[PDB]
Write an enzyme that holds these catalytic residues in place. Sequence first.
Site, PDB file in Angstrom:
ATOM      1  N   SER A 143       0.861  -1.158   0.000  1.00 15.75           N
ATOM      2  CA  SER A 143       0.000   0.000   0.000  1.00 15.75           C
ATOM      3  C   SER A 143       0.923   1.241   0.000  1.00 15.75           C
ATOM      4  CB  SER A 143      -0.912  -0.022   1.229  1.00 15.75           C
ATOM      5  OG  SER A 143      -1.934   0.974   1.242  1.00 15.75           O
ATOM      6  N   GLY A 144       0.724   2.128  -0.970  1.00 19.25           N
ATOM      7  CA  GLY A 144       1.500   3.350  -1.108  1.00 19.25           C
ATOM      8  C   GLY A 144       2.828   3.177  -1.808  1.00 19.25           C
ATOM      9  N   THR A 148      -0.810   2.807  -8.552  1.00 20.78           N
ATOM     10  CA  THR A 148      -1.905   3.599  -9.149  1.00 20.78           C
ATOM     11  C   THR A 148      -1.377   4.779  -9.949  1.00 20.78           C
ATOM     12  OG1 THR A 148      -3.402   2.938  -7.396  1.00 20.78           O
ATOM     13  CG2 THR A 148      -3.931   4.938  -8.570  1.00 20.78           C
ATOM     14  N   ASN A 192      -1.676   4.882   2.896  1.00 16.98           N
ATOM     15  CA  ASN A 192      -1.895   5.647   1.671  1.00 16.98           C
ATOM     16  C   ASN A 192      -3.123   6.567   1.788  1.00 16.98           C
ATOM     17  OD1 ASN A 192      -1.995   6.574  -1.006  1.00 16.98           O
ATOM     18  ND2 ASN A 192      -1.806   4.563  -1.927  1.00 16.98           N
ATOM     19  N   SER A 195      -5.607   5.363  -1.097  1.00 13.41           N
ATOM     20  CA  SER A 195      -5.416   3.930  -1.243  1.00 13.41           C
ATOM     21  C   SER A 195      -6.479   3.344  -2.111  1.00 13.41           C
ATOM     22  CB  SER A 195      -5.416   3.232   0.105  1.00 13.41           C
ATOM     23  OG  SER A 195      -4.675   2.027  -0.011  1.00 13.41           O
ATOM     24  N   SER A 196      -6.093   2.520  -3.112  1.00 19.46           N
ATOM     25  CA  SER A 196      -7.048   1.855  -3.999  1.00 19.46           C
ATOM     26  C   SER A 196      -7.689   0.753  -3.207  1.00 19.46           C
ATOM     27  CB  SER A 196      -6.338   1.249  -5.203  1.00 19.46           C
ATOM     28  OG  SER A 196      -6.204   2.203  -6.239  1.00 19.46           O
ATOM     29  N   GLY A 415      -2.623  -2.979  -3.028  1.00 21.62           N
ATOM     30  CA  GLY A 415      -1.357  -3.477  -2.496  1.00 21.62           C
ATOM     31  C   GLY A 415      -1.381  -4.154  -1.140  1.00 21.62           C
ATOM     32  N   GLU A 417      -1.015  -5.153   2.538  1.00 19.09           N
ATOM     33  CA  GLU A 417      -1.175  -4.306   3.722  1.00 19.09           C
ATOM     34  C   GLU A 417      -1.302  -5.051   5.035  1.00 19.09           C
ATOM     35  OE1 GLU A 417      -4.541  -2.328   2.148  1.00 19.09           O
ATOM     36  OE2 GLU A 417      -5.954  -3.149   3.635  1.00 19.09           O
TER      37      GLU A 417
END
Length: 706
Positions: A143-144, A148, A192, A195-196, A415, A417
């Site tokens: 994540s991050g 994206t 993030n 975050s997606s 991602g 996490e």
Amino acid sequence: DLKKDVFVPDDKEEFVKATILVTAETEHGKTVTVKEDQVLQQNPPKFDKIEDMAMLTFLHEPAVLYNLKERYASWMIYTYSGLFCVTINPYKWLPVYNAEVVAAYRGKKRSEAPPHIFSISDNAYQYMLTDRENQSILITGESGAGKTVNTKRVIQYFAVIAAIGGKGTLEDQIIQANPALEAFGNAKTVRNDNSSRFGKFIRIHFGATGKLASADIETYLLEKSRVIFQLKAERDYHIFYQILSNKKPELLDMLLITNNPYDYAFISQGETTVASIDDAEELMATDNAFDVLGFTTEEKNSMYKLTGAIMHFGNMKFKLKEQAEPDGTEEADKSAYLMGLNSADLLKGLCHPRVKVGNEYVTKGQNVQQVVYAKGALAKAVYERMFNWMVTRINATLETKQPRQYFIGVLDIAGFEIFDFNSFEQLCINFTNEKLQQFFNHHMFVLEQEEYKKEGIEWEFIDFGMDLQACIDLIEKPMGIMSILEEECMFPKATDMTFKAKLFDNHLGKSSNFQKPRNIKGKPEAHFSLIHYAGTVDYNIIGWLQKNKDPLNETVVDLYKKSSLKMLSSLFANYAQTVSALHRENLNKLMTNLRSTHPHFVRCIIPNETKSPGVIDNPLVMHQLRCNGVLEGIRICRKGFPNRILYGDFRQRYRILNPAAIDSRKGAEKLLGSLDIDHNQYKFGHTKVFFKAGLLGLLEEMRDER
Ligand SMILES: Nc1ncnc2c1ncn2[C@@H]1O[C@H](COP(=O)(O)OP(=O)(O)O)[C@@H](O)[C@H]1O
Ligand code: VO4
Ligand SMILES: [Mg+2]
């Protein structure tokens, strides 16, 4: 000096530079003496900030690490590492993505330009045209890490290129698709701020000759939980706060809402304001995208209205009449109005849902706990179906008449996490990450070597220790975690602790990745550990059975079918297979579709926890490179034959070098034998010439000189 410049290990920065005096003077002044085997050689100063790490004289963990750090220090965030790329999040705008850069990257072969996401996209385009084969850019990272952002840049490249020769054109619509989906599918988590909370596969279709003709987006499992629930340091979806900014004040009047996020319970249990996000300019961006994408004003106001009604739905209070009865219809009315529903019928449906007695019906009773769950569940159901309606709608405009022949898919999953509290949605997220890593492992290490065997190349297999089948099997295979969950949310007398007991009975001491929870004091409670590729995660199994069943108050969904808001009626039009079951079904569907494309791996690396630009936490960055198999992915390029040309195509292009040498195979034997080259750098296959790393560059350089 030659041997003086070395890398020595370090308990705080993984490894540190040194000068031999084995006794050696550290980069930070520490006179330290260590064991001869623990000393790795520094690369020559000619290889400082090297564009491709497969070209380094010394390949080891600190040689890769320090090269990445050096480039990052000069704001060079892309680096080739054999047949793939690695990128470290700058956490800062760099002037490397403008139109002038996009234009310059067009057609330039990998080596003819500096490492960049534009080069990956462009060369996927050349491979698609040259080989006549669908391509897929697969972007990885926690994540991050920057998946994206890199995903949006691939779209950008293709969209700008196609423009050089709904309301907008296909190219603008493809670009605007992301701000529209991010508004409803992205949210600030700890790791993030954008975050997606969902995976997406965007296919970009091209005609036989290379013209961009169409596009489609497929999304994978959205975090419904987020809609009505937050952890301390996280927000709900972007949209709620964007709408509450009041940049569009008509929205608040239409949606019958105050400007205060703390008024709505569903959306305000964590954080409300994010420094990184200006929710107001973002609402304009969100709305503008819908316009360029061709969304009607009814289409837009319907999405806004449905979001609004969800907010009011949270504030619906209930009391004991054990049987629940409403406790003030004010908010129940506001929601039913916005939803095109009858408020009394909504509450009678909620508190007393029907049970069919053949062609008649009898109501069932519900307590305040039961109604409060039902109420939450229906809001998540709506939001999920609204996101799905919105994706189909985007696809409907992106789907052109235009003739297609190929495609370039771009995978942007949510991602890897680890939160203070990890539940079902974390398992589904990390599961995909584990699967994609194994896709990289199989392609890079297994299929690669099996090609050398297929072609009768002299090759003795290498075991890179890159295999995650054990952990994948534990999650997906029968009697695994999902299989146990799937069977349990079928028995009606099952409980969180019966599922937990079944989980332990089948895997504690039996599955190596399944371990007892490493619960630390203060942190929330967990039931088990899962040794994932990128870390051990303590999962909490509370509520998983209801999450997998996902039942709704059918009586209220029937009023939704009957709604006088076209959108709400069509969301539940077909309503009548568990969550994890479809998740695996989609994931396996995806992994096999990616098997039928030529893949392009872009490995994103998060540099630090504190979102600090230019700042590299050596321990964290090394962990990523390690659990990604970057050093293994470089080794198979150096140790193997990453480049291979058919005897025909080798003749058609390189015959010029010595035209006296001209059969297709015998000719290549003479051509390579006659040229001044290391005759170990190339081997003959059944139908191809196998080039050792670098030799193909020499041959293309020698072709340019005449
Ligand atoms: N190439 C980049 N240039 C600038 N900022 C970047 C870049 N890649 C990532 N970021 C930063 O990192 C944040 C998270 O990146 P993102 O791609 O959204 O993460 P994830 O891997 O979760 O999808 C972005 O909001 C941005 O601040
Ligand atoms: O933060 V992510 O976009 O990787 O889910
Ligand atoms: Mg993302």
